């Protein structure tokens, strides 16, 4: 299944410069593609992806001299913009082959720089990076989507120190006075592009992305997010928090003063209190419907994978569940049923406990809520299955021992046994049985076992994470804030392009073509006393 | 009188160990109490409002009494059967159990957080703050 | 808003010794101050503070040779006690520019030592450190107030090992017998001064002080 393989590829692989020159002397083709299954992305665990072109194979295989020879041969010039069947060019292959390792990262960035420089020199009139594959992803977009931290870090901080190619670089130095110099970063296709932006791609990427958390440590991204926040998202978020708090207060007041006559609905009397109760109930139902509709809209827009449904979107799912409880409550209320009380109280508790979603926006409280989320996700089930097994087993044993009476039911005995965990056990809660020794032994064994269980719980989740929580929680909180910022920006387009990324700047003034250019720079200031 | 008796700790400075202890108390009361109490109060108030809404009438129909009973779970004196004047015992039990589990999780991440982030700084930062205190 | 900027400052910044010599050969002024907003303390995030004088700019910019040339030129002697509009001298600028980093700390202490030695040699009759700015803070007091740990640590443990300048140092060795030697530390304006003492300044400083 090696169809499409050519001897030129084999020669290039063997690092044989002279043999490659001899092979291409007769006029060996260079645009031939290897469509064999062995050269595909992931069809079968064995394989190797190299872009399906000989020049891409040379580029990805640590042969810069061969790349130069292929690009600047006098026999048959090698096309640099050629797009393979999957639409991936040299840059796409370089992005793919990276594994986010220091040595490999340095290799890939060096090769990317060299190939970009050669392409610019050969055909300066042709824009290279802006191109897209069949998937419609730019090389920067592809790197961001695949989580290649090194490639993205290099691209966002490109700096070329030789003439006639400064326009390629994304970082420029406006000036340098004394030990302090200002720097400019290019924000083209970063925040808003209407097709795919780096911030949008990184934000909405699934957790399967290797390094989604720390990719925001990049300097321009972090500073841009902070600036956007402090510019307008802080005010918008605070207003939203205030509105939601008013909603929750109104809902609590309406629910607390519910009438007690039975068989709803209830006719409203001509009194001020009844009017206030009715308007509060209407507002609560309206808010519930609004939350339900927003949740449905989000679910259609994003379409989670049903596997990361909980790890990602942990707050939207909870809000949607609260809204569902509200809708069930109203449906039962109009159906002349008295279970709307149960549904309403569940919704009310969920709503009050969902106020933690707004902790993000304050560093400490945000980290606290993030830790709560992480536990509820990845520890609760594992550390609760064991405890429930123990509790159920010992409760079944005790209830089997008991002859008859109030506690002969399994549920009551389970409740009494669970009372030991909250510091209210009895050890003498019944006497209708035989063999008091067996009863006492069972209860003491249960107590000792559950205490041992909790002790290894805490030992485990303290030892395995006392170090990661130092910065991992902060990184997750920063990601959370980024999600909030992007959602707030996209949702509130009513204010047009209010509070744009930055001002308009002229960094180079002239490109190789006579026409001038601007790159929507983002001014940044730093100081470096040493290494002038 | 209570404030005066509890302010005797100001004189612990002058003894290294007791001074460090009082300094740690001060640091917590300043930079952790509000952050770790807002969340707990939100949870407690929400669940108390839910339970009191569920209850029909009786001694515990007031919000304050229900809040007190729910808070009693934190000091190891909860009841889980403190009232029977309501309907849907399943809902009541689920609410109380969820509250208990959530508050225990809350305290566990409390301690994990303030242990992990400062098990190392307290080695000398508290001593330095105590020395500054003594200088003052 | 660069008013007060002079070509001499630009030449000094570019680390051009020969060009500076040519510029000062015609009689370029040295006491001119740059009052432009760009050279102010913190008016606008961009900027850089250097004492508002060319000699202070050279001192803060890692040019010891240029400092020596300016101080001991035969064309126009450079005043070392000159006080700018804000009342900050060379020592005050050196204190300001420190960021409490090992490399920067070593740089600033070395430059401070060199400038102090040169000032002592040029005009030994003039006391230098005791002077105060408009804020009324001595260089040691300024360093303590701003929390510059490195500068204060160096000043409190100054030791000069060449003749005719031992009086400048604050640390002295009374004697040294075997492997044990006694040391003396100068406590002038440290605990009680009636205006501003190092202990008083550090004690009552707000928590905003870095260290
Ligand atoms: C039949 C359903 C059983 C649950 C009945 C109601 C009690 C549920 C209490 C909330 C359970 C979820 C626990 C939780 O973690 O929510 C607290 C929030 O900070 C979570 O983060 P977020 O702000 O909502 O995004
Ligand atoms: C309406 C006011 C509510 C408080 C009513 C009285 C109960 C207050 C108990 C003291 C609250 C402060 C807690 C505290 O930390 O004080 C203990 C001292 O070691 C603190 O350090 P210091 O020696 O006083 O300087």
Author numbering:
A (entry chain A): 198 to 603, 627 to 752
B (entry chain D): 545 to 603, 627 to 703
C (entry chain D): 198 to 408
Task: Give passages from the manuscript.
The capsaicin- and heat-activated receptor, TRPV1, has served as a model for deciphering lipid modulation, which is relevant to understanding how pro-algesic agents enhance channel activity in the setting of inflammatory pain. Identification of a pocket within the TRPV1 transmembrane core has provided initial clues as to how phosphoinositide lipids bind to and regulate the channel. Here we show that this regulatory pocket in rat TRPV1 can accommodate diverse lipid species, including the inflammatory lipid lysophosphatidic acid, whose actions are determined by their specific modes of binding. We captured several states of TRPV1 ranging from channels in which the VBP is empty to those bearing different bioactive lipids, including distinct phosphoinositide species, brominated phosphoinositide analogs and a pro-algesic lipid, lysophosphatidic acid (LPA). Together, our data show how the VBP accommodates a range of bioactive lipids and how occupancy of the site corresponds to the structural status of the pore.
To visualize the lipid–channel complex, we added LPA to nanodisc-reconstituted TRPV1 and determined a consensus cryo-EM map to a resolution of 3.0 Å. Through symmetry expansion and focused classification, we captured LPA bound within the vanilloid pocket in multiple stoichiometries, ranging from apo to all four subunits occupied. LPA displaces the endogenous PI lipid by occupying the upper region of the pocket that binds aliphatic tails. As in the case of vanilloid agonists, Y511 flips toward the VBP so that its hydroxyl group forms an H-bond with the ester carbonyl of the LPA tail. Moreover, S512, T550 and Y554 engage in H-bond interactions with the phosphate moiety of LPA, while the free hydroxyl of the glycerol backbone interacts with N551. Therefore, the RTX headgroup may be better suited for priming this salt bridge interaction as compared to LPA, which may help to explain the greater efficacy of RTX as an agonist. Together, these structures demonstrate that LPA utilizes similar molecular interactions as vanilloid agonists, such as RTX or capsaicin, for binding to TRPV1 and initiating gating. Reorientation of Y511 toward the VBP is a key step, allowing L574 on the S4–S5 linker to partially occupy the now vacant space, thereby facilitating movement of the S4–S5 linker toward the VBP. Movement of the S4–S5 linker enables the S5 and S6 helices to move away from the pore axis while providing space to accommodate a π–α helix transition in S6, which is associated with the loss of hydrophobic interactions between M682 and the S4–S5 linker. Our structures now show that LPA, an important inflammatory lipid, binds to the VBP and displaces the resident PI lipid, further validating this site as a key regulatory locus for the action of both endogenous and exogenous lipophilic agents.
